[PDB]
């Protein structure tokens, strides 16, 4: 007489009409009655999964009309409000089912409910000892993926005297005895197992861990940010790989024997995969909106150093990069798309705080020495250029080493790096803007010799890296004058001149904080590519560039500075936020290239 | 089941084992022994299509079908005992059993993925590959303990839910209310791993039975006709109850479209009259990213074809693959062409060189060689390969099976794999001072190569601007038309060729011979490419060659082409001269190139006799 057929499976309660759970029963039942023809059927027949939005619930519809107490109850009601969505579900589907066979018996399964895009993200750092058994929201990373293995749930038991064997609903897989029996009449007992009958069912399982992002709150204390375990019930599984950004909602429970003394979980509800505010849009529209932008970002990258415009201009390339060609897609063979700078000149220069304000305005950083590390410490053995993907891993005292600098040839040129327990594959992706400071090998670098000499290079490292600039240390007067001036002060046309501040202005800088949002905005919305003009140019200084050189001595010319020059014009389209290549893109390529080319080796 | 049912599949299976299956049981009946144990081998397909009801009865409860199969092959054998003529040289054996193969290729059951827990009593077929071995052990099946209270024995069996346990009974079933060994089996435990190839997997702890322990091997492919079921365990008060997936084994296999076919032959039988258009296309689209450089890329090619081995009867084996080299200034894109070739082979295994350890070049645990059987291992940076672990490659580069025993273990292992070098010629290139002298490599490690190709990069106006165009303009594959190929075609094209064996003639040798002994001593002959290993590679890249064109019968056009283009190989001292490899381009028709070399080399080598037959060939085309 029971309308809803499926009330067995779900609450295990004697069918009574004074619940005040009809309601919303009522209540949700309309609301997908209403809704239904959207859904295909195939798909809940066979895993049962309703993704209801919470936006469509919060639009004030039926559901909000006749109890305004939504948000409340889920809240505070983790599976009294969850099951309601089964319910109706399963009533709606098995009606629709009846209805169509009727026109023209039912024994559909289990049907979970799924809610997710909960707004109010309470991150972690927060959860102690209130949210207990309470819905809330997470976002964070996979690094912990685990095996597979089965539990039961509903495992059945033998009799006692005569039969009417029962499916007592075991909870959360711990053992339990079923001290008293329902059945028709006498006493109970029938403490036997029976693990053999179809009654027993049975689903998977799994284990996650979640290490929370970088955020906020960068504090210089060397403390991991805290981390809690997933679990994954049914149908689940095989939905993340080690590394992900991923949201997860679910109910918040108490384990036990990690004797009072547990640990907190968390049971999943509803996983998503794959976002920057609407002040952060309006404020990088006005950063689009200045006059000159170049400058701005060229000036404002370290404000402390004076001079060393060249430097600093190629830095700011760096920092953006190029665009990846998959050209071929059956084949592919992809081509790295990010250039590769190193700086060498004599030491009081300053060369090693250009590097530091780099790495500090980046997504993702990092900043190693040339003596702590070995071979074992930049490759794999989680090495450096690993957690540099998608970064950079600048790298200090570069000259110094001299057993690893055979050991990153193969990962920055084939953009992957495999293991290193004898090459059994297992490749990993590594991504990296390598950037390095040296000196030469005789401390200051006398200006009669050659340059193959005075390196301690060979002809295959040094072709690698797209510029090498060259600095040297001269007894000047008027710039001496300027430094002294300026380094006190603290304490209290070509591509070079217009770029230089004329005193007399305000060049303010904009805040490295607002600057980092600018980068991850550039490298994820807008792809350059080259047009017909640009072309021509970088073809004409190829052309004279190789005869010209092919006879003189120098570092050999191949055809990787034609492939360099493209990615450098490319890498000159992101800082403005165009895709175009005009001849003055291309134009403002062949100064900067002029530094450690043919413009130095004299 | 109902009581006729198996009454009616028992009759079924009997008929059929008694219609085509009297010569294994024959032969299985005069055997010694009486009752050890012998199987017999059914097909599925042939009495799944006999009768319609058998499958519907059988694949929903495959537990009764093995019994009742095993009850008919008995009956079989006792009628046959029955109905003997010879008496005398046989023996009744009451140990039989039932191992069916030959399921049909439906998608949900030649799964190559391990059920997550949805597959219970299903019957499945799973590939993989061998991890780990158990020892061979004993088990106890039925005890027939003693009678106690009552009179009638008891014969209760063992459970394999419960890993091998027994229940004490109490309630017997005896009419009335009072109610209170030499048996032995076989066991083992194997652990399988999904292959990768097809594709992190995880594993399957298969369970053998009976006589299929001491059948299997540690790293072999396997294929197993098994049941799925579950192993609980002793139950624990509140705590977390623990359950497993586990695969009984049924049967064994020790393995290891008509389409595609006739594609290949409408290809290369449209393409009669000429027949070079056909390679010309094929050494078209091997990488087809780079310009020009066509003798490098035939080459490739032509290392990738193979081989075949020739055993000797008592104890010696020769090589029967190529190995190839290259030297040449940096930006030529060596390493492109060792990125195409580590994908179209079915198995390869890219490393470092440098970066990698001596475990991987040798046996330490499988390294790199071994690993790589059948195969191709592609090696880069040779310059400084570890000098020790560059030399302790001899024996496995050209013996084919390494030979250590390393701690006192002594173990033997095969490794057939053909090797890719790629390295930089360290020092500023010479036209002179030969290979031996820029890379100052030992001349018995120079003698092993096969191939050793050249490259320099000179002065020119028009190959600069080419390749400047190609790379700016975006240009990808400038012959616009649609030919191509894909990459899963060339990859069956060379997965399908390695199967024919080719045969040498009389119109072929003469050639290699007359020119070896030419080349044994011209007025230099070299310093270490004019051994005895250079004739025992004009036959293996001869042969080669041949198996590439769709035919098995060697001819004068494969070997003037093997001849000539080894000699090109050979850079500096020849017998006609070199010719730089990247300054070199598709001819626009080859029957005239080809006609002209055959004219070239058929007159200072005095074959005379062939160049009339060859051009009257020619000729009637
Ligand atoms: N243009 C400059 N303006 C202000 N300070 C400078 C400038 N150039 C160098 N310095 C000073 O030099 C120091 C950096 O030394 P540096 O040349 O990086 O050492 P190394 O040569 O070992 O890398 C800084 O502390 C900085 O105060
Ligand atoms: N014909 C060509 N067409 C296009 N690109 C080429 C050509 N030849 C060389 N290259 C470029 O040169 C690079 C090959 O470098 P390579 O010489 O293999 O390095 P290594 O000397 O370390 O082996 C490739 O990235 C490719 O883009
Ligand atoms: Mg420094
Ligand atoms: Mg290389």
Known sequence: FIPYKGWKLYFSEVYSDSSPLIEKIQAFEKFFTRHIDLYDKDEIERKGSILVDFKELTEGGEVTNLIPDIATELRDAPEKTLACMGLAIHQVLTKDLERHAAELMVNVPHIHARVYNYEPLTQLKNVRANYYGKYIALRGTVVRVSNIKPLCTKMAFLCAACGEIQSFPLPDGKYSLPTKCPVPVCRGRSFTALRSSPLTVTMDWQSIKIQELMSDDQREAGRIPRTIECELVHDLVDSCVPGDTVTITGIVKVSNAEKCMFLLYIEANSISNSEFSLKDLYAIQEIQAEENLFKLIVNSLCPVIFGHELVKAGLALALFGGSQKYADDKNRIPIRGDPHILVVGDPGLGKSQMLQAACNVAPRGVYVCGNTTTTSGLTVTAGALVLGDQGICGIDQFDKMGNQHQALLEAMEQQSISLAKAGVVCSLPARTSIIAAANPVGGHYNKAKTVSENLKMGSALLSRFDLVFILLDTPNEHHDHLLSEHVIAIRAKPLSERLKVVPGETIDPIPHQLLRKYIGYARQYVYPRLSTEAARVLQDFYLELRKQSQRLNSSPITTRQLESLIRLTEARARLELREEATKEDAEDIVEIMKYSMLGTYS | ?621
Not at chain 2, 67 to 91: G, H
Not at chain 2, 159 to 184: G, I, M, N, V
Request: aromatic share 8%; with cysteine.
């Open chain 2, 1 to 621: 089941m109902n009581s006729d049912q198996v009454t009616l599949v028992g009759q079924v299976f009997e008929s059929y084992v008694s219609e085509y299956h009297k010569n294994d049981i024959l032969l299985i009946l005069k055997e010694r022994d009486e009752d050890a144990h012998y199987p017999v081998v059914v097909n599925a397909m042939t009495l799944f299509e006999t009768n319609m009801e058998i499958g519907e009865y059988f694949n929903m409860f495959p537990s009764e079908v093995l019994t009742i199969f095993d009850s008919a092959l008995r009956r079989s054998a006792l009628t046959i005992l029955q109905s003997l003529s010879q008496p005398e040289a046989v023996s009744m054996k009451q140990n039989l059993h039932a191992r069916i193969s030959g399921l049909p290729v439906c998608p949900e059951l030649v799964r190559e993925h391990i059920p997550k827990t949805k597959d219970v009593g299903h019957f499945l077929s799973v590939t993989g590959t061998v991890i780990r071995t158990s020892l061979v052990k004993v088990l106890e099946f039925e005890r027939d303990y003693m009678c106690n209270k009552c009179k009638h024995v008891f014969v209760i069996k063992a459970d394999f839910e419960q890993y091998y346990t027994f229940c004490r009974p109490s309630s017997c079933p005896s009419l009335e209310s009072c109610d209170s060994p030499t048996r032995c089996r076989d066991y083992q435990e194997i652990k399988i791993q999904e292959q990768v190839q097809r594709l992190i997997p995880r594993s399957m702890k298969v369970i053998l039975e009976d006589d299929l322990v001491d059948s299997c091997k540690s790293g072999d492919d396997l294929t197993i006709y098994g049941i799925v079921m579950q192993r609980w365990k002793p139950f624990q008060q509140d705590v977390r109850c623990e359950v497993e997936i586990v695969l009984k084994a049924n049967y064994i296999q020790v393995n290891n479209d008509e389409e595609v076919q006739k594609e290949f032959e409408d290809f290369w039988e449209y393409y009669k009259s000429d027949p070079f258009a056909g390679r010309n296309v094929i050494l078209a689209s091997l990488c087809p990213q780079v310009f020009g450089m066509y003798l490098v890329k035939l080459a490739v090619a032509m290392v990738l074809a193979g081989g075949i081995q020739r055993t000797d009867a008592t104890g010696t084996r020769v090589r029967g693959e190529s190995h190839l080299l290259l030297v040449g200034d940096p930006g030529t894109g060596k390493s492109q062409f060792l990125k195409y070739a580590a994908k179209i082979t079915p198995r390869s295994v890219l490393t470092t060189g440098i970066g990698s350890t001596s475990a991987g070049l040798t046996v330490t645990e499988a390294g790199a060689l071994v690993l790589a059987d059948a195969g191709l291992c592609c090696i880069d940076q040779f310059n400084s390969l570890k000098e020790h672990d560059r030399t302790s490659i001899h024996e496995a580069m050209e013996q084919q099976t390494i030979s250590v025993a390393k701690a006192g273990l002594v173990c033997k292992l095969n490794t057939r794999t053909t090797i890719l070098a790629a390295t930089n010629p360290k020092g500023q290139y010479d036209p002179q001072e030969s290979v031996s002298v820029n890379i100052a490599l030992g001349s018995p490690l120079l003698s092993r190569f096969d191939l050793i190709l050249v490259l320099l990069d000179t002065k020119n106006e028009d190959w600069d601007r080419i390749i400047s165009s190609f790379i700016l303009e975006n240009k990808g594959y400038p012959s616009k038309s649609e030919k191509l190929w894909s990459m899963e075609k060339m990859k069956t094209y060379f997965c399908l060729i390695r199967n024919l064996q080719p045969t040498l003639s009389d119109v072929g040798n003469q050639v290699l011979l007359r020119y070896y002994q030419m080349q044994r001593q011209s007025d230099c002959r070299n310093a270490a490419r004019t051994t005895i290993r250079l004739l025992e590679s004009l036959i293996r890249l001869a042969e080669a060659h041949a198996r590439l064109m769709f035919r098995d019968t060697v001819t004068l056009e494969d070997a003037i082409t093997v001849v000539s283009v080894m000699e090109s190989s050979m850079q500096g001292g020849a017998l006609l001269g070199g010719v730089n490899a990247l300054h070199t381009s598709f001819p626009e028709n080859p029957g005239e190139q080809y006609q002209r070399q055959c004219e070239l080399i058929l007159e200072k080598l005095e074959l005379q006799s062939l160049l009339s037959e060859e051009l009257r060939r020619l000729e009637r085309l």
